[PDB]
Structures are given as C-alpha cells and as structure tokens.
Amino acid sequence: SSLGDVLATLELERVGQWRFVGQQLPAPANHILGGHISAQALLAASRTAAGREPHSVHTYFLRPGDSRQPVDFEVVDLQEGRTFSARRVTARQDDKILMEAMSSFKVVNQVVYQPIMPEAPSPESWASLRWFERRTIETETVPPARVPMWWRPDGRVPDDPVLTASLVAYMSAVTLTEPAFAARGGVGASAQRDHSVWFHGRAVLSDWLFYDRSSPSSAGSLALASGTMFNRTGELVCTVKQEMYFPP
Amino acid sequence: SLGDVLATLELERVGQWRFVGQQLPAPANHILGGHISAQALLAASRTAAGREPHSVHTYFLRPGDSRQPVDFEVVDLQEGRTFSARRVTARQDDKILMEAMSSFKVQVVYQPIMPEAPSPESLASLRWFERRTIETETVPPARVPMWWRPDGRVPDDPVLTASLVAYMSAVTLTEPAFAARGGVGASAQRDHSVWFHGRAVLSDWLFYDRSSPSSAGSLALASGTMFNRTGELVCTVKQEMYFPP
C-alpha cells in the first residue's frame, strides 16, 4: 500500500498567496501520472477558495514531468463571487508548463436526478497506482469496451471533503486508460491529453465505489474515455471524460 | 441569421495574441455562451498555424454586455511538433467573462453508432440554423435528439466549421436540462466542453443527440453527441449549467 505516501504528497507546501509546491513520487519512467498532478492542482485551487468545494475541473496535460523533481503550482483568481469561485492552476517544472487546469467552486446547500447505478456483484464476490484496492467486475474489449470496477482506498481517509474530491479525481484519471487500451487491441504507448470531472455528490471512501468506465470513440491518435462513479449506496459521485493520445 | 453570425465570428486582430470580437443583440443584453466560446475558439485557432482543434473547455464566469465588444487574450500554453494548446481569456473592461483552454494538432477509428431517426425531410443567433425536433420527453435523462443545419451556406473553412459546431452545440444543450426540470427554472451556463472527432459537414443536416444525465441541485449536466448525416461522429459534448433557486 502507498496511501500514506500519496496523502503526504497531496499535502502541498504553500510558498505564497497563490503558489504551492507539490512533491512527486518515484515512478519507473519517471513519469508523473496525470491523475496525480491534476489532483495536486485541484487541491491548490481548493485551498485558495475559502470553504468552498469543487463541482467541476478541466485539466490539460501538456508536457511530461520529471517525477524526481517537485512541481510548482501557480493559482489564478478567475472569479470570486457571492456564489461561485473559479481558478486557473498552472503546473511547472522550471520554465516548462506541464499542465494547466480550470476549476469551479460553490457554497453548498433542489431538483435532483442521476443515472441509475448498474446492478453488479458485490465486491466480496508505481506509487500512484498502489494506494487503492480494486475489483474489475466485467470486461468487454469491443467498443465502447465497458470495464466497470469496484474500488476503495487501501487505508483510512481523513474525511476531508476537499481531499476526498481530489482523490476521486486522482483515481478517476489513472484507471481510465484501460478501456481505451482495450478498444485498440492494446500493446500501445499512450499519453493523457486532458481530464474532466463534474462532481455530483460527496464521495464515501469508507466503503467500495463503483467506477463505470468505457471508451466511446477514437479519432485516430486521440481516444475518448468516459466514466461515472457511484457510492456503494448508489448515489452518483462524479461524471468523467478523458482524452488521450496514441502515437502511431 | 447566418451573415450576422459569420461577421461577428471574424474577429479583428489587434495584436499577435489579442483579438476583438463584436457582439450581436441578445436577450437582456447578455451574451450567449455558445457565441463567446466559439469566438474564443477562433481566437485560439488563429494563433495556431494551420492546426485544427480536437478539444476545447470553456468556463462561463460573468455575464457579458452584448452591446459592447469583447477583448480576447490568447496565451501559448504549448507549441510542439505535434500538439498546440491555448488559453483564451475574454474581457469587457477588465471584467473576466469566460476562460477557455483548447488543444490542436496537425489508423484506429471507432465511434458510437448514430441513432435511427426519421429523415429531417419527413418532419438570434440562435437563428443562423434550421432545426428538426425528433422526439420530446421531460423525465430524466430527457433525451431530445434533433436535426440541424445552417440556414445558409458556410464558407468551408475547417476551423470556422468547428467553431460553428461548438457554437450550436452549446446554445442547444440547455433544453434537455430545462425540460428535465419541468421547464420552470431560469438558467445560466457554467461550462462547455467539446471533443472533436470527424470533420463536420455543414452542407447537409447533422444529428445532435442530447440528454441530461444528472442534476446535483442547482447544477445540471447536459450531454451531447453530434453526427453528420452520413453517421460519422463529429463531436462529443458536455455542459454544466446553473439553475438559481
């Protein structure tokens, strides 16, 4: 398990009113994982939004980062309103821009609906990868290649609403390659290009979570991946979309 | 009408990274998301030399005054051999109206199959396009697919075409969410996201599948997939919108 090491790296060091440094964890590559850097960037934005939770976030992964060096996150105030907040986060290593993200926030409480969580057998039946347990429920490789899974963090989580959201985003990104990799026939190196999350309800990480995954489309080198996450109770947690690059 | 739309989408360049876009008369003097995000996408694109957008993410932050023009600043996020990325910030007198990020580039293809539908024949802006409404339901997901084509012939610039796709995909995606609510709630768009697939053919009708999968109180999600009449996927779309209590 590597949850303790993950949680540590997710505790960013503030070096300014709008500036943070995020420690990276060793990877064979050493390639920084999108989900990791976008989770850190989301925390960066969140900490500059006073007692407000993220309801959506859009992240572009622009350049591959060196996980042996830490990452500088600059936050920019796009909007600060009575109801909503908006942030820009730019992640850098030296002069290099690794990713840029936008995120939106509001203060929390009434017309509610969601997709119904698919019936599935209950779950009883790389540092960035090892912090969570997983049960891959069922598999198809022909597009849309639905490969839904059960997952939970391997360890106890502080029950920080904001930390939980970034961990949801964290995991939502790193597990979303496989449906696309499956649809292609596999054996192909890929790079994530962007990640998008819309938050619905608050995640319960003290139990298993259902992460429905698929790859609806691929326009050549670029494949789309789609995701919906549920609490074991069946409440929708987040809706997810991801675009990734496959070099010919 | 199309002529007025095309005119405003042709931005005036005032710098290497700066454009001014004219606005068209709108209800309550407020600018439609689709219009400003399409302008922003064109702003970014004109800073990407002979590259087409494959995706774009736009946040709508403050309502803009459609009686005054808009300043678009473009920022070079990355310029590589294969990919380009841009940030676009739209302002009215230092007020930030929207921000957008977009990505650009210069043998495995798959898509969802286009849904069976009656031919469109067998059946301001926003006024530049014709439309045929296939079916209506108000109970979630409230799928309301439609046929659309421009009311007029478009110049056949691949980049202009994409911005018009994004333009229309945004302004038509409110309805699923509004319907799902029962058609009472006044709304504002919060963000718009487009992933481009195949190149749009605006010389014929296009299939736009629309739905509203979820609503978490004041924030509703809307989802869309657009097809050429041939059944080729043009773009996938997601939109988040705010309904004030």
Short mmCIF file of N, CA and C in Angstrom, two decimals, chain A residues 37 60-65 71-72 74 88-101 193, chain B residues 75-79 85 87 101:
data_model
loop_
_atom_site.label_atom_id
_atom_site.label_comp_id
_atom_site.label_asym_id
_atom_site.label_seq_id
_atom_site.Cartn_x
_atom_site.Cartn_y
_atom_site.Cartn_z
N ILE A 37 -0.89 14.73 -10.71
CA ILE A 37 -0.59 16.15 -10.84
C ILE A 37 -1.88 16.97 -10.89
N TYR A 60 -5.64 20.03 -18.68
CA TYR A 60 -4.87 19.65 -19.86
C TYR A 60 -3.49 19.18 -19.44
N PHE A 61 -3.07 18.01 -19.92
CA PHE A 61 -1.72 17.56 -19.67
C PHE A 61 -0.90 17.87 -20.90
N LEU A 62 0.06 18.76 -20.74
CA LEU A 62 0.72 19.37 -21.88
C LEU A 62 2.09 18.80 -22.13
N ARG A 63 2.85 18.62 -21.05
CA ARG A 63 4.21 18.14 -21.16
C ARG A 63 4.50 17.11 -20.07
N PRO A 64 5.28 16.07 -20.40
CA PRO A 64 5.64 15.05 -19.42
C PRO A 64 6.57 15.60 -18.34
N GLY A 65 6.26 15.30 -17.08
CA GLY A 65 7.05 15.83 -15.98
C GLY A 65 8.03 14.82 -15.44
N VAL A 71 7.01 19.96 -8.17
CA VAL A 71 6.25 20.76 -9.13
C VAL A 71 5.70 22.05 -8.52
N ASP A 72 5.88 23.16 -9.23
CA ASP A 72 5.36 24.46 -8.77
C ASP A 72 3.96 24.72 -9.32
N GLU A 74 1.04 27.45 -9.70
CA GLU A 74 0.54 28.81 -9.60
C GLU A 74 -0.97 28.84 -9.76
N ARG A 88 -7.65 29.20 -12.07
CA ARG A 88 -6.72 28.63 -13.04
C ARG A 88 -5.53 28.09 -12.26
N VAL A 89 -5.05 26.91 -12.61
CA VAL A 89 -3.85 26.38 -11.99
C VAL A 89 -2.87 25.97 -13.08
N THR A 90 -1.65 26.48 -13.00
CA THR A 90 -0.62 26.12 -13.96
C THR A 90 0.50 25.39 -13.22
N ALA A 91 0.81 24.18 -13.64
CA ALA A 91 1.86 23.40 -13.00
C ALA A 91 3.15 23.48 -13.81
N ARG A 92 4.24 23.81 -13.14
CA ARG A 92 5.52 23.98 -13.81
C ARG A 92 6.67 23.22 -13.17
N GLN A 93 7.60 22.80 -14.01
CA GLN A 93 8.92 22.39 -13.59
C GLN A 93 9.89 23.28 -14.33
N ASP A 94 10.56 24.15 -13.59
CA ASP A 94 11.37 25.22 -14.15
C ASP A 94 10.54 26.10 -15.09
N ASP A 95 10.98 26.27 -16.32
CA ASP A 95 10.27 27.15 -17.25
C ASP A 95 9.20 26.39 -18.02
N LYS A 96 9.20 25.07 -17.84
CA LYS A 96 8.28 24.17 -18.51
C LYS A 96 6.88 24.08 -17.89
N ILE A 97 5.86 24.30 -18.71
CA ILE A 97 4.46 24.13 -18.30
C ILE A 97 4.04 22.68 -18.51
N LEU A 98 3.70 21.98 -17.44
CA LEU A 98 3.37 20.56 -17.53
C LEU A 98 1.88 20.36 -17.76
N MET A 99 1.08 21.10 -16.99
CA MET A 99 -0.36 21.05 -17.15
C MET A 99 -0.98 22.39 -16.81
N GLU A 100 -2.16 22.64 -17.37
CA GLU A 100 -2.99 23.76 -16.95
C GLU A 100 -4.39 23.26 -16.67
N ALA A 101 -5.03 23.84 -15.66
CA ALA A 101 -6.36 23.40 -15.25
C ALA A 101 -7.28 24.55 -14.91
N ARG A 193 -4.15 13.49 -22.51
CA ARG A 193 -4.10 14.85 -23.03
C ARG A 193 -4.95 15.79 -22.18
N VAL B 75 -3.15 32.95 -25.02
CA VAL B 75 -1.89 32.62 -24.39
C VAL B 75 -1.39 31.26 -24.86
N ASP B 76 -0.12 31.21 -25.24
CA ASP B 76 0.51 30.00 -25.73
C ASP B 76 0.87 29.09 -24.55
N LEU B 77 0.06 28.05 -24.36
CA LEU B 77 0.28 27.06 -23.31
C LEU B 77 1.34 26.05 -23.71
N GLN B 78 1.30 25.62 -24.97
CA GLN B 78 2.33 24.75 -25.52
C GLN B 78 2.33 24.80 -27.04
N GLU B 79 3.53 24.76 -27.61
CA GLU B 79 3.70 24.73 -29.05
C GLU B 79 4.74 23.67 -29.40
N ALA B 85 -1.51 24.05 -27.57
CA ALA B 85 -2.56 24.32 -26.58
C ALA B 85 -2.66 25.81 -26.34
N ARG B 87 -4.77 29.07 -24.08
CA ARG B 87 -5.71 29.62 -23.12
C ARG B 87 -6.27 30.90 -23.69
N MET B 101 -9.65 26.77 -22.49
CA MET B 101 -8.45 26.08 -22.93
C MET B 101 -8.81 25.25 -24.14
#
